[PDB]
């Protein structure tokens, strides 16, 4: 129990932090990855002067603060502001004292060696956690779907990745990163919806375009004869009621937004798209392992939640793969937390105890120890 | 949001009734004080005219 | 059943406010008429005593 | 007690001064904002030659003096004559010595920086008050209705304003000023009442048109089918008895006067009206704060006292606002003193002590100190 209860799992994202206790089924804490700094001197009624704001209080009060994102494209870019988000996570969100809890953290696919050593330096030397561990994100997603070999298409708020994993070892030279994700996708909907003849003028109009994207957006299979369908004008249309009455209608654009993930050309991106990239990762891997990867395309991440994403991907890679092959696109329902759940499982596991980096290892080996 | 909207509705209807009741009582106390005031003002003007004439 | 419960709540809150407002105005018109009535009664008794003495 | 008893609250208006002690429920002193200067040399029986007259003695003796209004449209226009009204307030009206009383003053919505510094210069350097503070008027009105975010429609004798306030900070760029108020409104009634076939000939006829406006005027909802009602001639009419017997009747015009506040066109004004202006203030503010402002339209000022003002405004903005919105027009009974009461509360408060500008702050920082 000492640490059975006690292991923490913190998944640091570009848009959201997911956090909680190893053992739980889902994150106890989910909140924006921002750190707000007040543009002016003054106070809220009853509070003192605050130097900084994090998560939702930074979002809610955004009009008087300069908002900053510590993690650009999955990589920690500002370490002063990240130690601020961690502090908030332990002390306010989970309300635990960190110096008696083992902490499993996550990093990104080709996270620079030096960063994995730096967050270890900050975990052990400024938070004084007993022990910690850094798992790679795609690797926890795979594992949370039971398996050990597969290829994960991972897509969240600032990055998309393909991480081919074989008997647990993520394959460095076959990993692909595509910098277009849910953030890019909300801003494109924004324009095709103002372009539908609308105005997201006040900040209460801006924010909810993102809630339109999440609730009403679709990834149609045969996106071709779906536009064609749009035109005959079926009961395909969908009206959402705004903060007030102002019933906005979205028929068609509803799927023009996730067609951006297959066609980056919709947004002036010259890069290849999700399905081709799944494939290219795969023809960059060893030959003998390619049947395995093909029958185990595990999807994780908030942006892979658009319904019919899996069917489109299913047919997208069948038709690029040699017919002798078995294609299989696994997309679980909890996928917006796969990464986290994979960490919860792993860290609550009976056999993981012997991989925890302890302060004994650290004080004796330097940050190098956990770096592997 | 409902048990909340119905509960707020019931409490405001209760408040409404209490205030509407307090009012029939204050507007009624009134026709009485205003009528007493006018009755005295007319007794006053009469005696003010009679004091003028005896003076 | 809701748009109905909320609509009934809003109409009764509106009614409640209208009556509560009509009341601050009638109870206030009051302190004024009762005070005017007392002020006149005292002017009356004074002139009633002065008419007696000039008579 | 030193200053718990001792804080003064002076609200300077275009028509009236409201004054008294922080702590009280209502102003101890209310009087016209005039300064009379005798047109001829001479005296009243038993008095000496008087150079000047202020408040009610200036109004009562107006036939031999040239009357002047120091505050034009809420802004202090003549500083020689204002120091005269302040002097009168402290020494004659409240009969206090100012050099041992902290003084909370009020200013108008976009009061020029230089004025807030000038009345501070006069408070500290010619009245020698221990400490002072200048609050913005709409902001005290809001606060006196308990809240901190809302939009105040403030309307008195020379100005109308809309001041959207968010967690206490009045929003400069969303404030609207409409120069038509109770003064304009008494003069319009005047004409529709002479136009009813009457004569307000002597000064005892002039003054009481204003007491007709206050006692008998109404703001009808559906001002349309209220004129229509006037014509069928119901027992809608209302006769007022003048200083003498001369019973004057006012049926209809009774509401034609406050319909001027929604239709400025009744008086050759091309500006928009109260309700549209409430609204425009609101579509000039941030988007995310517009649901707040809509559910918190606080009314203050002598001219917002016309019965049924709130119902007309209620329906005026519901029908301009998106139906998804909650409208809420708060109009308290003490509203002709909201501003003052908000100051009384605030200045008698336990936490305000640390915002008082003291002579220590001033003698050391210059007028800049209180200016903020």
Q: Residue by residue, what is the 3-state secondary structure of chain D?
A: CCCCCCCEEEEECCCEEEEEEECECCCCEEEECCEEEECCCCCCCCCCCCCCEECHHHHHCHHHEEEECCEECCEECCHHHHHHHHHHHHHHHCCCCHHHCCEEEEECCCCCHHHHHHHHHHHHHHHCCCEEEEEEHHHHHHHHCCCCCEEEEEECCCCEEEEEEECCEECHHHCEEECCCHHHHHHHHHHHHHCCCCCCCCHHHHHHHHHHHHHHCCCCCCCHHHHHHHHHCCCCCEEEECCCCCEEEECCHHHHCCHHHHCHHHHCCCCCCHHHHHHHHHCCCCCCCHHHHHCCEEEECHHHHCCCHHHHHHHHHHCCCCCCCCCCEECCCCHHHHHHHHHHHHHHCCCCHHHCEEHHHHHHHCCHHHHC
Interface residue ranges in chain C relative to chain D, Cβ cutoff 8 Å: 14, 17-18, 21, 24-25, 28
C-alpha distance from B11 to closest chain C C-alpha (Å): 9
The CA distance from A359 to A340, in Å, is 24
**Does D307 touch chain C if contact means CB atoms closer than 8 Å?**
yes
- Answer yes or no: do D324 and A241 touch at CB < 8 A: yes
Give the CA count within 13 Å in the CB-facing half-sphere of D39: 9
C-alpha distance from A202 to closest chain D C-alpha (Å): 3
Q: Beta partners for D104?
A: D9, D133
* In contact, D38 and D64? CB cutoff 8 Å: yes
* In contact, D131 and D359? CB cutoff 8 Å: yes
Q: Beta partners for A48?
A: none
Alpha helix segments (H runs only) across A195-252? 203-216, 224-232
Backbone φ and ψ of A331, nearest 5°:
-135, 90
* In contact, D338 and D145? CB cutoff 8 Å: yes
C-alpha distance from D305 to closest chain C C-alpha (Å): 10
C-alpha distance from A199 to closest chain D C-alpha (Å): 11
C-alpha distance from C24 to closest chain D C-alpha (Å): 7
At A36, which helix (H) or strand (E)? strand A35-38
Contacts of C7 in chain D (CB under 8 A): none
Residue appearing with tokens 């009528």 = B35
Best of C10, C21, C22 to substitute, by most chain D Cβ atoms within 10 angstroms, is C21
Q: Which pair of structure tokens corresponds to residue A94?
A: 């989970």
C-alpha distance from A209 to closest chain D C-alpha (Å): 13
Nearest to C19 among B5, B20, B55 (CB): B20
Contacts of C28 in chain D (CB under 8 A): 333
Contacts of D309 in chain C (CB under 8 A): none
C-alpha distance from D326 to closest chain A C-alpha (Å): 8
Cα D178 to chain center, whole Å?
Answer: 13
Contacts of C40 in chain B (CB under 8 A): 37, 40-41, 44
Backbone φ and ψ of D42, nearest 5°:
160, 180
C-alpha distance from C25 to closest chain D C-alpha (Å): 8
Interhelix angle B2-54/C2-54, nearest 10 degrees? 10
Nearest to D322 among A45, A206, A246 (CB): A246
Chains contacting chain C through 3 or more C-beta pairs under 8 A? B, D
User: Which residues, 6+ apart, have CB-to-CB distance to A35 below 8 Å?
Assistant: A52, A53, A54, A58, A67, A68, A70, A81, A84, A85
What pairing do the DSSP bridges indicate for beta strands D65-68 and D35-38? antiparallel
Closest B-chain CA to C37:
B37
* In contact, A17 and A11? CB cutoff 8 Å: yes
Residue appearing with tokens 């860290």 = A347
* In contact, A316 and A262? CB cutoff 8 Å: yes
The CA distance from D194 to D248, in Å, is 11
Q: Which pair of structure tokens corresponds to residue D82?
A: 């204002």
The CA distance from D225 to D219, in Å, is 13
Neighbours of A300 (CB within 10 A): 32
**Does D329 touch chain C if contact means CB atoms closer than 8 Å?**
no
Q: Is A240 strand, coil or helix?
A: strand
* In contact, D357 and D105? CB cutoff 8 Å: no
The CA distance from D32 to D54, in Å, is 8
Contacts of C24 in chain D (CB under 8 A): 333
Cα D217 to chain center, whole Å?
Answer: 18
Contacts of D310 in chain C (CB under 8 A): 17, 21
At A20, which helix (H) or strand (E)? strand A16-21
Contacts of C21 in chain D (CB under 8 A): 307, 310, 331, 333
* In contact, A138 and A300? CB cutoff 8 Å: yes
What is the dihedral angle through the alpha carbons of A43, A46, A49, A54, rounded to the nearest 10 degrees? -90
- Answer yes or no: do C24 and D311 touch at CB < 8 A: no
Interface residue ranges in chain A relative to chain D, Cβ cutoff 8 Å: 42, 44-45, 63, 201-207, 241-246
The CA distance from D185 to D219, in Å, is 13
The CA distance from D154 to D342, in Å, is 14
Residue A65 is given by DSSP the state E
What pairing do the DSSP bridges indicate for beta strands A103-107 and A8-12? parallel
* In contact, D68 and D37? CB cutoff 8 Å: yes
Residue appearing with tokens 């649901």 = D291
Contacts of C23 in chain B (CB under 8 A): 19, 22-23, 26
Give the CA count within 13 Å in the CB-facing half-sphere of D356: 27
Contacts of D148 in chain A (CB under 8 A): 45
Nearest to D333 among C14, C18, C24 (CB): C24
* In contact, A66 and A37? CB cutoff 8 Å: yes
Nearest to A203 among D167, D286, D323 (CB): D286
């Amino acid at each position: 129990d000492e640490d059975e209860t006690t292991a923490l799992v913190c998944d640091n994202g570009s848009g959201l932090v997911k956090a909680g206790f190893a053992g739980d089924d889902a994150p106890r804490a989910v909140f924006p990855s921002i750190v707000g700094r007040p543009r002016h001197q003054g106070v809220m009624v009853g509070m003192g002067q605050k130097d900084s704001y994090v998560g939702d209080e930074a979002q809610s009060k955004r009009g008087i603060l300069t908002l900053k994102y510590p993690i650009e494209h999955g990589i920690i870019t500002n370490w002063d502001d990240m130690e601020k988000i961690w502090h908030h996570t332990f002390y306010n969100e989970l309300r635990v004292a960190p110096e008696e809890h083992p902490t499993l953290l996550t990093e990104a696919p080709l996270n620079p060696k030096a960063n994995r050593e730096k967050m270890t330096q900050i975990m052990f030397e400024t938070f004084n956690v007993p022990a910690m561990y850094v798992a790679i994100q795609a690797v926890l997603s795979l594992y949370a779907s039971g398996r050990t070999t597969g290829i994960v298409l991972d897509s969240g708020d600032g990055v998309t990745h393909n991480v081919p994993i074989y008997e647990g070892y993520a394959l460095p030279h076959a990993i692909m990163r595509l910098d277009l994700a849910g953030r890019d996708l909300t801003d494109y909907l924004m324009k095709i919806l103002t372009e539908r003849g609308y105005s997201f003028v006040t900040t209460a109009e801006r924010e909810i375009v993102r809630d339109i994207k999440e609730k009403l957006c679709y990834v149609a299979l045969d996106f071709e004869n779906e536009m064609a369908t749009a035109a005959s004008s079926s009961s395909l249309e969908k009206s959402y009621e705004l903060p007030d009455g102002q019933v906005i209608t979205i028929g068609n654009e509803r799927f023009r937004c996730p067609e951006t993930l297959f066609q980056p050309s919709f947004i002036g991106m010259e890069s290849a798209g999700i399905h081709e990239t799944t494939y290219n990762s795969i023809m960059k891997c060893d030959i003998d392992i390619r049947k395995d990867l093909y029958a185990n395309n595990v999807m994780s991440g908030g942006t892979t939640m658009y319904p019919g994403i899996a069917d489109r991907m299913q047919k997208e890679i069948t038709a690029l793969a040699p017919s002798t092959m078995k294609i299989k696109i696994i997309a679980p329902p909890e996928r917006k937390y796969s990464v986290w759940i994979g960490g919860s499982i792993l860290a609550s596991l009976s056999t993981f105890q012997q991989m925890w980096i302890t302060k004994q290892e650290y004080d004796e080996a330097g940050p190098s120890i956990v770096h592997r | 949001d409902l048990e909340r909207a119905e509960e707020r509705a019931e409490l405001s209807e209760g408040k409404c009734a209490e205030l509407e009741e307090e009012l029939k009582t204050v507007t009624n106390n009134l026709k009485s004080l205003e009528a007493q005031a006018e009755k005295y003002s007319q007794k006053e003007d009469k005696y003010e005219e009679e004091i003028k004439v005896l003076s």
